[PDB]
Structures are given as C-alpha cells and as structure tokens.
C-alpha cells in the first residue's frame, strides 16, 4: 500500500473532460501555429517571474496596447498546457483574453487591462465594491471549473481590475491544470498565503475546491482588513496559522477521513480550539463584516475540500444579495 | 407681497450674498449666440408644454448632442435657464450645456446613453439604488450650495448611463435662484413629487423642496411601487401624503406656519400615521434596510425645515456600503 | 435548372469544399433557444417586409442590445440567417449576434451608437471615406472568404459609431452561402445598389455582387450624389447604369453570357461611355483623386468577373493614406 | 547701445494679455490654495527630469488614474508660473488637464492619458494619421497662443496620444511663458533638436513663432522618416545643420534684418546654398511626401520668425484638406 485508496472525486464538474474531444485536454499533442512576432513591439517590462517575463506591447498593425509574455524555452508541456487552457477559456466570463501566439522563445499575446495594483486599489474598496468584484471573480472561477480547469493560483496579484470600467479579469494560468477524476496532482502549486490544507499535508487528490480556499483567503483578507489572513513564514508554519483558526479537532478528523499521513514535522502543532470568525472584527472592518459574510466565510475556509462551497454555491449565498442581478 | 408665516432655508441661505449681482441677475445677462447650422436634428426626442427636445449632431465634432429648442414667448425665463446652466458647469452629475444657438432659441446639451427609468429601475439592486441616488444627491447638494433649487426632481429628469455608471440631472427650466424670504410659484415640479408646501400654497419654500422630491424617488425605488404617492390631482396628492404621514404631524405643520386650508378637503379624515416598515412586503424586503427606514423617515416630512438637507442625506449611514468618504 | 452561360467565382469558390456539411447545411441546424424575458423592448427601431427591429435591454448585463423579431412564415430562411451569423462571429466589422430567443423568433444583436448615413456622410472627409470603406471591405472579404455573399450592401446596412471609429455590417437576412454553379434569386439587394447581373436576370452570380454594391456606395460618397444610379424602377436602374458605363461594354457583356434581353428596353438608346472624371464638380474635386478614378473604374463593371474582389480593392493604392499594411 | 532697438512684435495675438485681469499674467502673486495630498497615492514612477519627478497615481476617492508631478521646492516663480498657465488653459483643445494641486514640495495632479511612447507609435503612422494628429497639435498651439502663452518646448515627448480614442494632449508646460510685446526672453528654452534659429543666435525678442519652428521640426521628421530632422551635436552645430538646409543667404539676411550680433564662434560656418525639400524624399517616405506638404514645410521652417506660418494659418493649409472638417 503506497498510493492512497481512500480517494476524493469532485462534487461538481467531475466528468466534463470525458465529454470533450481528445484535442481539448491532450495539450502535449497540441500544434501551435505561430503568427509573425514583429507585429508586436515591446514598450516596457511590467515584471518577471523566473518562469516568465511579461512586457507592455503594441499591436503595430492594430495600434492597441497588449501584454506580451515571453516564456522560457526550457519547458514545452507546461508551455502548451497554458496555451491549451487559454484557448479553451477564450469566451469565458472575466477570463483574460489570449489574442495571439508568436515565436522567434514562445510569446503569448494577452489583452491589456488598464488596471491598478492591489496594494493600493483594495484599501479604497467599500462594502459593495468587495461584494461586486468578488462575485465577478466567482464568475470566472465557476466557468473554468465547469470547463474542467482549475486555476491553482488564485491571489489578488493574478486578478486585474479596471475600476474605471467595473471590469475584472483573472490572469496567470501557468499553474492551471485540467481535472480528471482520480488524478494525483503536484502539491507545489499556488502561493504560500493561499495554499489550501490539502497542499500543506501533501494530499494530491484535490479538485476545483483548491481555487475555493484561495478565494476564501482573499475574501477574508479584504473584509477583515488583514493582508494576508493566514500569515505564515513557511509552508509548515502556514498550516499552523490555519489550525490556529479552524482548530485541531476538525483538522485531525480531516486527516482521518482521507487517511492522510501527516509528517511528524507537524507534531509540534499543539492543541488548538476552533475560533469564532467574529473575533477578527474590529472598529476598522466592522462595516465590512456582516452576518451574511461570517456565514459565507465559515463555509468556504474548511479543511474538507468536499464540504467547501463551490463557486456556484458561493454565488447564490445571501452575502451577494445586495449586488446580484435577478 | 402676501402675509404669511415666514421661513428661511437653514442651509445655503446666504450663498447669493457671497456672489456678485452678475451671478443671479438672469435678466441682465447678455448671451453670445452661435450659428445653429453646426448642429442638425436626427431624431425628435420629447415634446413639451414649453419646449421640444431632439437628438442632435455636432457636425464638426460629429458626436451626439441633445438640442432643446424653446418657444420664444418668454425672454426672462429663457434667460433664467441659461443663467442657471451656466453657473453649474463644474457641478458633479449636472448636465453640461455645451452651447446656445438661434425665430427660436436652441440649447445644446451633452448626450447620455441611457435606458428609461421604469425599464432600468426594476433591474436595480440594493447596490444600484444606494450608488445612483448618492450620485443624484451630489448634483442636488452642489446646485443648492450654488443657490439654485431644481424644483423638478423626478426619474424622468435623471439620466443614467448604466454601462458607464454615470448620472446626470437634466431639465433646469423650472429651476430658480434662492434668495431668503421669497415666495416662489407653488406650480412647480410634477404631481407625484410635489412637496406638502406646494399643496397647501406655502410659497416661502427653499432647497428642501428637492429633498421631498428625492425622498419620493427613493421610497418608490426601495418599496417597489411607482409612484409612492399615487394621486389623481394635486388635492388627492395631499390626501395620499397624509394617509401615510398621519394627521397628527399634519396639524402641527399647519399650526407652525398658520396655513389656512382650502375648502375642498372638507371631507378629509383623521389618518393615524402608518409606520414606514408597514410598506415592506416579500418582494422588497431585501431592499428595505433598517438604516433606510431611518433615512426615509427624516426625508419625507411635512415641515420642510426638519427634512434632511442634501449633504446631511449623503452622510447618512444608508450610503455606507457605497460611499468612499 | 435553367439553361444559360455559366460563371464561377474566380476567388473563394471552393471555401465550402473545405468545410463540413455542418457549415452550410442551414436546414439541418438545431438552434438552442433561450428565454426571451432576459431582454425587454425599449423603443421600436425599424419596420420591415419580413421582420421588426427594436431597441433592447439585456436585463442581467443591462447593456443596450438590438432585437430583430421575425414573422415565422419561413423556417428555412430564418435558419439561414442564424446559420450565417453564427459562422461569422469572429469576422472583423461583422455584427455580433448575441443570442436567439422565442409564437415568433427573436435575434439579439449588439448595439452600435451611430448617426444615420445621410446625416453623417455629408460630414465625411477624404480620410473618413477611405478609412470607413476599408473597414467595410474587411467585413465583405471575410464573409466572402467564408463562402457567404451579403447581397444587400447599402449605407442603411452599415452601422458606424464615429465617436469610436467603429463599423459593423448588419442585416444578413438576404445573405446566402455560395456553391459554384448555383442560380441565386435576382430579387436581392435594393434598387440603387443592384448589379447588372440582377437586372438582366443572370442568376449565376457570386461574391462580386457585393462589390458592385460597394462601388455604388463609394462612387456616391466621393462624387457627393446619393444615389449615384438614381432609377425609378429596376428597368430604369439598368438604363441609368448603361447611361454611364456605355453601350459598347454592355454589348460585350450580353454576348459573353448570351443574355437575351427583355422586350421593355425596346427604346433604349446607344449611350457613348462617359468617363469617370466627368462627374468631378467644384464641390467634390477634393474627394476625387486620380487613384480613386482607377479604383471606381475597376469596381463598377458589367462583367462581374472583371470586377475587383474585396481583397483586391483593399490592396489598391486608393487606401494607401489609411491602410497600415 | 546695449539692448537691441530693431525689435519684433508678434503678428498675431500681440496684445491679448492687456485685455485680461492682472491676476491672469501676474503669476508671481498667485495664491495657490492647496488640497489634501493623501487623496493621491503614488503607484509607479513614470520618469524624471531634474526640475521634476512624475509618477503614476490614484485618486483614492475617485479611484481613477492620474499623474502626479512633484516639483522641486527650490523655485517658486517657475512653480506658480506653470500652475498659472495650466489654470488659464484649463478648457483648451488638446491641452493637458490639471485636476488638483497638493503640497506637503508642491504636487500637481494631471489627467492620465493611456498613451504609447513616440519611438514606437509614430513608425506605425499612415499619411492621414500624421495629418490628423498634427492638426490636433495645431489646435492646442493656436489656443494657448490666442491666450498669450507660448509653450517653448514642443517635441514628440511632450505630446501624448491615445490612439485608441484618437486623442491628443500637449503636456509639460514648465517652460511655457506669457507673451508681452517687446519682452526679452531666456533663449535657454526648448530642446536642441527643436530650437529655433532665434534661440541659437540669442535673439530674445521671439514670440509664439517659437512653437511653430518646433512644430515644423516635428512634421518634417515624421513625414521624411528622419528623427531628428536637424541632428546637431551641440547648440552651435544645431545651427549649422539648419544653415545646411535653409542656406546661408537667407541666414545672413535674417541677421541683418534684426541686427543680430552673431558670435564669431559661428564664423566657421561656410557658404551653404538653400536645398530643395524634395531632396530628402526617398522610397520609404515617398507616400508621405506630397506637393502640399513640401509647400507647408517650406513656409514653416523659416529663419524669419515673423514670416513663418502661424498655428491658424498652418491649419488652413491645403495639406490638412483631406482631414479638415468643414
Ligand atoms: N493583462 C494585463 N494587463 C495589465 N497588466 C498585466 C496584465 N497581465 C499581467 N500584468 C502585470 O504583470 C505583472 C505580473 O507579472 P508576473 O509577475 O510575471 O506574473 C503585474 O505587474 C501585472 O499587473
Ligand atoms: N441629454 C440627454 N441625453 C439622452 N437623452 C435625453 C437627454 N435629455 C433628454 N433625453 C430624453 O428625453 C426624454 C426626457 O424628456 P425631455 O427632457 O422633455 O426631452 C427622455 O426620453 C430622455 O431619454
Ligand atoms: N445593431 C444596431 N445598432 C444600432 N442601430 C441599429 C442596429 N440595427 C439596426 N439599427 C437601426 O435600424 C435601422 C436600420 O433598419 P433595420 O435593419 O430594418 O432596423 C436604422 O435606423 C438603424 O440605426
Ligand atoms: N498625462 C500623462 N499621461 C501619461 N503619461 C504621462 C503624462 N504626463 C507625463 N507622462 C509621462 O511622463 C514621462 C515624462 O516625464 P518628464 O521627463 O519628467 O517630463 C513620459 O514617460 C510620459 O509618457
Ligand atoms: Cl456537475
Ligand atoms: Cl479530437
Ligand atoms: Cl486603426
Ligand atoms: Cl474564539
Ligand atoms: Cl457685485
Ligand atoms: Cl416660475
Ligand atoms: Cl399617531
Ligand atoms: Cl444596511
Ligand atoms: Cl463532413
Ligand atoms: Cl432568397
Ligand atoms: Cl465609346
Ligand atoms: Cl490620392
Ligand atoms: Cl490678433
Ligand atoms: Cl485682477
Ligand atoms: Cl466610484
Ligand atoms: Cl538641393
């Protein structure tokens, strides 16, 4: 007994990839047909990871602004995986639009969003600005989940917002992966402040519920005015900050339910009792904190990835009633 | 004159005292007219008792404009509307009169892409109502701070481009400068949004008339009932107002201003005041908040002096989920 | 069938040979209808012999949309228009049919803010004519490259938002897929923009019919004379065409296709061909360029085969001051 | 005889400042009433001179994008001069809009223009894109000239263009100065590639004609596809590149007409004959070069600042006929 036989299957959108052609999910055999690259000239470097280098660009023929993303030519399966996902989510709500793909180092052309950084735009948000833009983020998450794709990197950095147009786009799909039921995925995904408990205990049978925990970490940070909500120094300490809030009783139960072998590096985790979400409320965030929010955030930040609210169920929560169009 | 109990606006009463005679003297104004051929008519927009509104084209800019041509029977009033639109050019959510042209005079307004109110308002959320009415309060507070009453606040005169989240208050033909101690014509605004001061012929009103008209718009949008005060006439309009606000506060309102009432309501009854929460049904319960009931109670009042001013309404806790301040 | 001299499009003839039967078989199509209550009617836009167009509201998006409701007398044709609009969703300057709804069927189109043509076109510069007609050629070349003739190119079917420099070709009810060797109904397009092939009952036409309609639009915009071929009827429409293009080239056109002419033009005269520069007066001399006269001569021709294709017209030197390529 | 008595007066807009109140042109006694500065937060530094430092900003209350320009607190007359000119040209065609002024180092808040740099957007221009945007630049120049203000720094850097909206704005008024007839101004204005001959020979009695020469240097560069048109290594060599094209006969005449004492540092300037503007035409720029352009550029790049075309006269030239709305 090496693999785990106690296994999880997504409650929603479990078998959507089985109803699509092989060319949809088989990104390794995708055939990218490249367009001329001199139709786009680099203006300014927006930033860089070490998997990528994004720039501000010019569609020399269309003379609009676009964002070019030069990928490292060291990996191809990850390269064609991102192009595969963006091409499938081309007509999705609040999904970043991929306009072209060039080479001669593959370059991916995205639409430019006149956005403002998150460390400055969010502190200016009101109560209904949070409920609105998060609902728009749920629209993008629910679509790709319905298309068998989990983002696996939901964070305020990867969420562009054009507040002048009330526009939101979810970007950075380099970590997104297709969901086949029963698949064991890499746990080294997302970022520390938004990693789910399944990633910190090395439970590889996760589904779209991963993007849901990162969404809860975002919503809890903006409403409670604490960035990040779970502030951990390490991946080991990140789980401690989660057990500190959700308690140890439900954590050990989450492990016994899915028979997760918790490495005894987490033995130093002591007894923690579950806290009330109301304890994080102060004079600054008291207008953003509501009874509807405290209920929604309680059903989002769960150990059990199956008992968490789906993107569609979160949209129907009463917390978005003052903004939902009927 | 006309002997009556006096009343002065408790706010923005001495604004015109701080401005030259050039500001409010709308008859001394000399208008520099411009050629009318720069604008052509595309589609007729709205008829009128005193004007006609069309869809226009700015032949050099080729953008969309709105032309309001007037019958020339009134010089002093025509100059009054041009005087007011020229004083509120920097006003937030105030329509921007672009030019005047020449027979008859024509006024060029900026074009706002919008959907009619009773086709757009039924789709408004709690967010949309608090956001847009706060934008409307921005226009009312500025014009009042400039010494100008609108005297015709109604959803027809509120242009909303929802795709751009814009709001523009339009139609300033019934507007007027406010000088303390001046009877204005009670034949202003429209029936469903007339204040009790217009219905009892109390002519010394002020900016608070627009606040009653604002409360009529808000109460109907929240309670989902247009109009909120459905009246057959200006006499029945008052009866429908006291049917809700009560006979007790109505008696105190007539005593404070010594209002000798008309013979027609002879058969008016004693209406016990109905609480504001009694209008909350299962269809609008999500729009009826506890802070709204406090706001709607401090706006819809007989005595115009105890009504909330525009600025006082913008600082109310009802707009907390939408206000940046 | 009907015995005649044959003709095949020299371009884009085998496009439908490269696509599945699912593409052009518009009767096998199964449409997934959607609720109509998501869209409400605000203002009626245009009447029609076969449809009615209104201004709409996308109750959830609350943006402006355009609803074209149809009489249900024709299944196969209704499916034909939906089939064509669904194949050109990525087409440049093609109108984006957003949804179909349900009695009668309704088609949701995107809304374009624009001014009527004969109020906007008189304000067009040399820049505006070359730029916008090049945008219209983008829509024609794409639909032709997709095997679809429009068969109704006219300024009424060209929506221009000049404030955003946008152009959208609309009204694809008369459109049709092109298969080589197929008589199409000569009762297409409108009188002022009908090609000579429709007027002599030559049914084996192709995409070049839209190019004659394009040349009629361009020649009138440049020479400032709408319409360029003013005809009382479809018979007089031809007489006005040969009055300019000449009887000599008309004889060669009837010989190449063995067109036995109708009895009605019995009294037609011999018109010497009038040069294209003779239409340059002092009012349009700044719009009449030397490269335009070459372009207008290679577009307005009897023989549809020798007319310029859409792509050939876009690469013409007339669009050099505006084309990026 | 120390000052010059052979003197020049603007052919147009000579006495416009005499018809405006004293508060209009007397910028030294302007009273700036500052607004709170924490309503604007700095996002990214766009660039810097050593008289200024411009940043990308956020109207925290309006949540739109603005450009903040923090001036050095070393000079005040130049500080209030720029605020004086921007406030007077507030409702001008294609003039950059000043929205607010803050302190606590004075900070000037401008409207943000979604523009693209000039070294990349101009090589994509067509024939009618040049005629259009230059006509829009003439609209801004003619307005401020009609308001008694000369920009004195017209260059492609100081011209923002939102090609997506067909929008143009003339920025950077730190060198702009009010025009009083008979005034001797500082010749150390503008930039080398666009300095007029009056600046290179130290003729201080120039008027709005200064902005006209810089406009001609811009139009000649974009049509002939040579940036810059007069490429000089120094201020002394810059005049040599001008005499190289316009000839020495008209130059010595320009000096004898206005009795300009040319420092014998320019003695090494030899005999130059006037060239034909047609000689700068090649296969690349032959579509942009037209008979109407060669006439307009010949009447713009003149030694005599009085004989140059005004901004209004340049707008009525036949070169802008295919784009001018009648
Ligand atoms: N579509 C876009 N529009 C505007 N900025 C973008 C876009 N995509 C990425 N960025 C910027 O690129 C940076 C992130 O790059 P990276 O860290 O390489 O993922 C941030 O500054 C983002 O704001
Ligand atoms: N500035 C404007 N922009 C767009 N529509 C307007 C404007 N002004 C008036 N309308 C229309 O005119 C009607 C209002 O009545 P009136 O003010 O009499 O024209 C409504 O149908 C409005 O949509
Ligand atoms: N998508 C659209 N956007 C704006 N106006 C339209 C649209 N489609 C049709 N129209 C209007 O409808 C008329 C054209 O005739 P029809 O296609 O029969 O409605 C003109 O008045 C157009 O302005
Ligand atoms: N209103 C504006 N919108 C966008 N960029 C601007 C604006 N004003 C100045 N800049 C930028 O500021 C830089 C010039 O700053 P400086 O060299 O200090 O004058 C250039 O990168 C300009 O594009
Ligand atoms: Cl499912
Ligand atoms: Cl397949
Ligand atoms: Cl373009
Ligand atoms: Cl607790
Ligand atoms: Cl005074
Ligand atoms: Cl009156
Ligand atoms: Cl009572
Ligand atoms: Cl509330
Ligand atoms: Cl097939
Ligand atoms: Cl047919
Ligand atoms: Cl002949
Ligand atoms: Cl030409
Ligand atoms: Cl003058
Ligand atoms: Cl003064
Ligand atoms: Cl806002
Ligand atoms: Cl020469």
UniProtKB/TrEMBL annotation, chains A, D:
The keyword Repeat does not apply. GO terms for biological process: DNA damage response; donor selection; filamentous growth; nucleolar large rRNA transcription by RNA polymerase I; regulation of cell cycle; regulation of ribosomal protein gene transcription by RNA polymerase II; regulation of transcription by RNA polymerase I; regulation of transcription by RNA polymerase III. InterPro entries: CK2_alpha (IPR045216), Kinase-like_dom_sf (IPR011009), Prot_kinase_dom (IPR000719), Protein_kinase_ATP_BS (IPR017441), Ser/Thr_kinase_AS (IPR008271). It is found in: Nucleus. GO terms for molecular function: ATP binding; protein serine kinase activity; protein serine/threonine kinase activity. Catalytic subunit of a constitutively active serine/threonine-protein kinase complex that phosphorylates a large number of substrates containing acidic residues C-terminal to the phosphorylated serine or threonine. Phosphorylates YTA7 during S-phase to promote transcription of histones. It catalyses: L-threonyl-[protein] + ATP = O-phospho-L-threonyl-[protein] + ADP + H(+); L-seryl-[protein] + ATP = O-phospho-L-seryl-[protein] + ADP + H(+). Heterotetramer. GO terms for cellular component: CURI complex; cytosol; nucleoplasm; nucleus; protein kinase CK2 complex; small-subunit processome; UTP-C complex. The gene is CKA1. ATP binds at residue 69. This is Casein kinase II subunit alpha. Its EC number is 2.7.11.1. AMP binds at residues 49, 111, 113. Residues 40-320 form the Protein kinase domain. Belongs to the protein kinase superfamily. Ser/Thr protein kinase family. CK2 subfamily.
From TrEMBL, chains B, C:
ATP binds at residue 68. One of its GO terms (molecular function) is ATP binding. Gene3D superfamilies: Phosphorylase Kinase, domain 1 (3.30.200.20), Transferase(Phosphotransferase) domain 1 (1.10.510.10). Coiled coil: none annotated. It catalyses: L-threonyl-[protein] + ATP = O-phospho-L-threonyl-[protein] + ADP + H(+); L-seryl-[protein] + ATP = O-phospho-L-seryl-[protein] + ADP + H(+). Keywords: ATP-binding, Kinase, Nucleotide-binding, Nucleus, Serine/threonine-protein kinase, Transferase. Residues 39-319 form the Protein kinase domain. It is found in: Nucleus. It holds the Pfam family Pkinase. GO terms for biological process: DNA damage response; donor selection; filamentous growth; nucleolar large rRNA transcription by RNA polymerase I; regulation of cell cycle; regulation of ribosomal protein gene transcription by RNA polymerase II; regulation of transcription by RNA polymerase I; regulation of transcription by RNA polymerase III. GO terms for cellular component: CURI complex; cytosol; nucleoplasm; nucleus; protein kinase CK2 complex; small-subunit processome; UTP-C complex. InterPro entries: CK2_alpha (IPR045216), Kinase-like_dom_sf (IPR011009), Prot_kinase_dom (IPR000719), Protein_kinase_ATP_BS (IPR017441), Ser/Thr_kinase_AS (IPR008271). Its EC number is 2.7.11.1. Catalytic subunit of a constitutively active serine/threonine-protein kinase complex that phosphorylates a large number of substrates containing acidic residues C-terminal to the phosphorylated serine or threonine. Phosphorylates YTA7 during S-phase to promote transcription of histones. Belongs to the protein kinase superfamily. Ser/Thr protein kinase family. CK2 subfamily. Heterotetramer. This is Casein kinase II subunit alpha. The lineage of its organism: Eukaryota, Fungi, Dikarya, Ascomycota, Saccharomycotina. The gene is CKA1.
